[PDB]
Amino acid sequence: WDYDFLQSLGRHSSVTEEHVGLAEKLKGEVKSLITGPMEPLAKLEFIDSVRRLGLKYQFETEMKEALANISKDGYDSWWVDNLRATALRFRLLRENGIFVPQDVFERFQNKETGKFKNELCEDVKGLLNLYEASFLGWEGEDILDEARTFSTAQLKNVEKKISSPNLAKIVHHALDLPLHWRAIRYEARWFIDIYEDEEDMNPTLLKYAKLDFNIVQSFHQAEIGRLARWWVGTGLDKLPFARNGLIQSYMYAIGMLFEPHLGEVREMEAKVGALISTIDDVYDVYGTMEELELFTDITERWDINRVDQLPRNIRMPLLTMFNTSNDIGYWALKERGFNGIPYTAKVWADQLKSYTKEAKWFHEGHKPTLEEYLENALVSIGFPNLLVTSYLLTVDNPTKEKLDYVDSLPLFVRASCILCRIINDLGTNLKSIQCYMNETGASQEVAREHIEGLVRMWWKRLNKCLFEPSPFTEPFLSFTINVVRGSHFFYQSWTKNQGMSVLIHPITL
Amino acid sequence: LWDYDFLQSLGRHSSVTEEHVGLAEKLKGEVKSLITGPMEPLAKLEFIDSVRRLGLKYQFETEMKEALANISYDSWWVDNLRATALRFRLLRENGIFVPQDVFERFQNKETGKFKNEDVKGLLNLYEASFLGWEGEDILDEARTFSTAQLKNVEKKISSPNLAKIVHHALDLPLHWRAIRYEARWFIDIYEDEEDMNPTLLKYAKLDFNIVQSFHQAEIGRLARWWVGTGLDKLPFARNGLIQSYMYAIGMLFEPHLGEVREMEAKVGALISTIDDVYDVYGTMEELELFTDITERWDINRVDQLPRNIRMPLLTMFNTSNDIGYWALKERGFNGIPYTAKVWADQLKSYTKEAKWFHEGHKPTLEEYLENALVSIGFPNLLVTSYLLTVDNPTKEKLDYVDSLPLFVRASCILCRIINDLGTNLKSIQCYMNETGASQEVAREHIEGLVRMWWKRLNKCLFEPSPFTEPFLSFTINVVRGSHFFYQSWTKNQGMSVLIHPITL
Amino acid sequence: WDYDFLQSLGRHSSVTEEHVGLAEKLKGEVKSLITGPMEPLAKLEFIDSVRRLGLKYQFETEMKEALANISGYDSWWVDNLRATALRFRLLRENGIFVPQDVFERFQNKETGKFKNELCEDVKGLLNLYEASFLGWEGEDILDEARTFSTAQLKNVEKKISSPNLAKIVHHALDLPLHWRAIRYEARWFIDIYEDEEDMNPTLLKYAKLDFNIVQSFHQAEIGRLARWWVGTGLDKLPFARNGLIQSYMYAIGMLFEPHLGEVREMEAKVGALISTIDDVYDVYGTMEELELFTDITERWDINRVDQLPRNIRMPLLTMFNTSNDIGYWALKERGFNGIPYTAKVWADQLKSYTKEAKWFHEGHKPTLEEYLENALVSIGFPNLLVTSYLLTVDNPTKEKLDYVDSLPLFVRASCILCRIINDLGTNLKSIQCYMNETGASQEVAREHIEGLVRMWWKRLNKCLFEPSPFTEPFLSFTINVVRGSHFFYQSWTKNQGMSVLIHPITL
Amino acid sequence: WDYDFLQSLGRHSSVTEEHVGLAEKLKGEVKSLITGPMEPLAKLEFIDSVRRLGLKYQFETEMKEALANISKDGYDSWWVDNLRATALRFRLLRENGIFVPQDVFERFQNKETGKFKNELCEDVKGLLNLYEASFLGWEGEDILDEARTFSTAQLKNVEKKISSPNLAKIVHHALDLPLHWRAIRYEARWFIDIYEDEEDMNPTLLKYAKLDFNIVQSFHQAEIGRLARWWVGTGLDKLPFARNGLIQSYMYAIGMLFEPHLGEVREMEAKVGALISTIDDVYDVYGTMEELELFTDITERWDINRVDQLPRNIRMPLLTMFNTSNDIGYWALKERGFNGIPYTAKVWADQLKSYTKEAKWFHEGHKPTLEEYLENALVSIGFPNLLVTSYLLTVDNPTKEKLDYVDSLPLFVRASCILCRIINDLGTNLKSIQCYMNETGASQEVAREHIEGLVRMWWKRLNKCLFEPSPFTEPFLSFTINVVRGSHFFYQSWTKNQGMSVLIHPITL
Ligand SMILES: [Mg+2]
């Protein structure tokens, strides 16, 4: 699984014109099912299955219309009495922009205690739906927070009592990471196999999911091949800091966006990620403070007059970053009619400045507070760069004002960047947990709990931001949520198996 | 103004012209440039406040929010109270919290009293204090201090424009003043300010004339609707439609909400007629039938109520069904159950009050207000406004709004106490019976309740909520409208706001 | 940071009898390593590591004997400056004189400047820089080595690839080892030694264990002092928030050894009183009240204390009671009543305060020498050092106490250093007084004061080699108070507090 | 070759203060060239020329820095495809402690056969670099062994086909002995004249090499004068044994160490060598078994009570040896702070014991196996004595443990001692060759090849030992390799000519 193999990818695709034709036929049939009459709860379950299979992109309009009709109903008898239905309706409506109040769950609470009634401690699907629905909550929605802790504890208790292996796998999967926090492409790969074993499974939807996944995978294989050839062309692959960073970066980009129509944007994002990995090793280990300061100054000024001062192992990544930023800016000028080079140069400069600040603290024995560390670390995570670039390459009618606003890191973008940083720190000198430990003296386990609380808080803010008015539109909103999901999935070897399963091996038909 | 024949004629001949619209959009672009353009921060705050007072905030909301965000170094404002109070008020008004401790510097820690000639400074402090919440004692003290000082300095002012402004603030703070009426008054006041921006003044005059033309068309349609219903021929509520429409203008004036405003005016007109029917015209047997028919939404027996009562009940029934259908057609959600339910609840509240009056009951203030908040008719008006404006309406949301949660309840209670203050047994009398206190002390107690409920409404605005615009503005604006309407004089306000254009 | 918390300290100790046993076993092993044969440069480096880790108190005689034997087979170090400098610094630090001419061979005869080749060895530059602070006045070769090594280390700091070495270089540039407080530097060095390539695991483990054991003693001391402070009731006074914890940290800088816990606590008590009284004279007190406070202290007669208000009388009585208790402790343990000396030194300190207040109330602007002659007394170190001498000197007598109270050159240098160090770290102070005396700019004046710091240190270094009536541990107290001042005046004290006093080192 | 002349040497030196000043000026210029930018192949060739001229001691640090930078240049295009560059880089890097794998030569091998391709048996310098590089190989590196045999056969074939006399001389010299096995001082003298006639010669380096040679020669002349006076002082000059033996020992010692700063150690080594020659003759010819047994027992006990039992001709060498060993131990005590008398006495005891064992085998008609003969002969050659003494007089902070370890026969020292013994036996009743002949009955020619194979094997072990971790450091490492080189040089009259050329006659300027 080296570069010679990756460059080869995309030459021979398993999919055939017959497979694509059957896929478009099944797509029409699935569209008919989605818009066709169905019992409301059944429709909600089907729509959820379509989303879980990674097919929401194909039927986005039909799904939204169907949910809207199911929402504006003067008859709530079908769902109000049982929690499983109430939770499924609450989650799907919120996920598609239709607000459902938390008060919908008061009936299931003890008025005196305020805790959820134990009568649902027995139904696994009821607990699973409540648990998933609790992650769509906003700040101050204490009913949802109680549902979260209740369902989490109950699912942990009932996990061992489950007899059906498929259900046990589903429950363990949800406990590990809720659907709301799971990367769409990877979850789609897992769900195809899980959905196959469900008793109430729809063969047409399952077949379409397998065919569409294989067809999209062929696009991904071609992109892996082009990116691998690009990386070898740059020569960063022969550097120590590259390692398997290029393929890892592509996997992260797959988590951010997997749709075929965004292949060019995805390739550019993967390039930025690969550069991030190589420069990360250069600043963290290889570079000397004098060399790194020169690297940062060169980036801030966009002047390569002294690159020749730096040694080859440092100069080559700096020039590759410079050339890539210039190419991405030119691509933006050619396709979107807006020169993006000033923004790409600025975001790389800001990222390098953040690295310089951390290196200076590491060299001066400073120990920052959690808020001080995070203010720099949200920038240093590299996502501000990734999100701004994604906005520049996808926004409709780009302008200096719009790019400047996104570059300002408003609350919606800031929440995502902070989440990526804290999630990364959670998975593994001084990180969020250690900074908090020094700030409060608390034990490592309690500090980790505090950081986890921050994770939940930032997700609540992201969820509310999706409902607030915003200048952003699709697909930037999805990029912002998906980078967080990709981080959750990637920071819980095993990455080689996920790479082969999602990108290399097709699903057998 | 009080002739249906005259009102129906309106909308046929509009004073505005395409040239006026073009000049309006040119000035609008210039004002946007000024609002987002560089300016000294205190100057920017003053300009943004002036755009609001001219009733132009709807046109430049995002720009203003940004400029205020940028305004939120801090040396220019921390030292001086005039600047501190203006920044505090504007920031709180736009969702940026500013603590009351910002006024700690301008008060002796040694003495719990704001120290003692800036009239504008006192005005800014007074207005900012009404943006205060419960428990913000610094703001409350600043309020009482500024009120006493402004009353004291009112007589020492030589400049008539400033004297009018001070007297106006003493009459009603900006926070409690109806936006459209205040905008009309401020246009003339702003004209006389030395540091006035001519472009902003022109845009304010032009935009007012255009909106007024929209209101004239709405008045014509509503007048024709009223004569079509025939309630105009009945004896009660002489000239109630125009009154109801004026109240609705206070609630919402923006043109894009004309259909919602017309429907709100229709409900108001029905309130005016049915209120007279229950308090004076109807007999207890007739009222009980009217209430039962509304609660069950079955008109089988309407033919038992005499014509003078049957016609209002049927107009109410048809109007509620029409509003519900309009909701079904435009928002894809049948609102007839909610319009019927809120009218049933309102009639039930009337029946309960009539029974208390018929049984010599004297309720406690809390007992009276729990029913009176419903009887004022604002739960009906606010729920209808929510049904007609919320994005993606649902049964859950309508049920929640209909439950009268704290945000809605505060507005309803405020409107009831405000009406009673302006004007059987009311809030003041009920308190007098509950504590035996004198009328003057009781009125002060009610005024304190008004301030308390305003603090709560203000607090609700910064907490997370299911509600968003424009419902949040409907809730605050109905209270402002009540303050304005319950301080003849309505004919002069009618001609000035609805009929006569501002001369150019 | 909370008095309830500090009083709570000492209730639950992390250390266990097994940990103590393992500590004494490792101690024996470290003793064996310190006295056993080893290559000379390696031995010097090991001894230096022992000193930086704060273990010198445990292994002091073996270190002195080893250096004595090392002081005739001396060829191993003459060739390289790094070894020469390490030998010079450690020998001077341990009382074995080494002449400055030992570095002339590495200097250019014509120019008199050091050869640029030593710029290649980072370790070489570090040893030269540290060795330059052990110099006396007139040792110009050492002074040149100082300026040279400082400039070279600044130049090579950015060129270092090893992060641990880079951290060490930046730390030395911030403050040389000679000027760093032993306990705080020991805490910092423990972590660095783990990441040093040439680390001894037994010594490292012992350093971690011994630090934790000493920390338990400090926690108990903090608890005792916190209960004492609340008992006095000065905690509820508006003045001197967290004065007690800052004073205890300062005492830790002055002396950290466990056997001196009682003396350290008394020093901390004096410090806490100083913190409270400073606010009373500088801010809270009226001229009439302060003049009365000073007269009461001079007479050691409290008949008129009730004239003062409660907020000012309380600190005066607590100071009076504390001084009487410290004097009694001296009488009971050392068989010599120290109350006259504690009363006299408290009198001389507040009179100082009165003299400064007189300058402040009459708009006087003193010359630097005039200001410092009073300010050395006002900093409070004469009081702290005299009390420390009274509580530690062997067979105390009136003559010995009078001599120390006279502020001879060795004590005076430390007092002046502490006052100027405080002024350097923080309306006329030492710097401003110089600015008025010479009209020079603030930037030039700061350099002049820094020069004074180096000069006074040179005098202290020479005094350590001159014959003196003073012996240990007073000599260490005198040097350590200046080191404590350098460390404390470079918030951040909370970060040093948690690391040194509250949280144990994980094993 | 007369003691009066040797004692006379050192009185009048040809060098002048001007010559030294010019030497230090040229030294700075050569140092500048060594650290200055240069073409990579040119730099490798220049460093090789500096080493061949015997100037490595002067620029040891600059050479190490230059080679260190050359190993991580990353740009490998200049050497990866050229055999000459690949071999030169491999040899120089290994010689300076930078490991280079044998696989670097696979590209130049025929994949099917595994033999080297004939395509490069035309270029003489290419073959020369390959041949020299092959002697830096370790055991199990069959590629290097093949390179050795291939290049040797090809160089023999093209030697007669070479037209350029300088190239023909270089090829003939390499065939006689590779650079790796050549004594540094003697090779430096030989190379100076050849380098002058090489087309790509650096005049500054040539001049510095000639000047430094003259200065070092003056130091050696002074050493010869002192040693000659010491020898006449001992009075073993007039004894029948070891005629003209002292100077030979000094010449041999020059091969072991030639640097002027080690003159004192070199003089002591020369003294030991002279004593070895005289006592060797005493045991082999002059002494009776009774006298030799007494000599060995007296040496072993280090008790001279019975010296008067021995005749004057034997007592004088024994006493001179006793006084010299005691003096060397005292010198160690004075300069290194460690009394070395027990070690000098012990190594002389071991050497005499080895002589006694061989004489006993000779008197009992024993025929040892090759391993049996070598086990004693490695001690009898006298290199264990010379190496232990050299370690005692130069190691930093000597200790009983280090001296005991060196006195032991660990792999690094033992390999060198065995090599010196087998090389000496190869050059000249039963020795290594005859012992093998008796052990296997094999013919003399096959036996000589087997011993040569042992020489190659032990050299491979020495090369690996230099790369293995060791307690030993410089200059002991150099002494251990150089004693082997000195043996190769001394055993294929001609030594008188080499003496005059290296020690007496200066290079004309
Ligand atoms: Mg980094």
Ligand SMILES: [Mg+2]
């Ligand atoms: Mg009524």
Ligand SMILES: [Mg+2]
């Ligand atoms: Mg003071």
Ligand SMILES: [Mg+2]
């Ligand atoms: Mg022999």
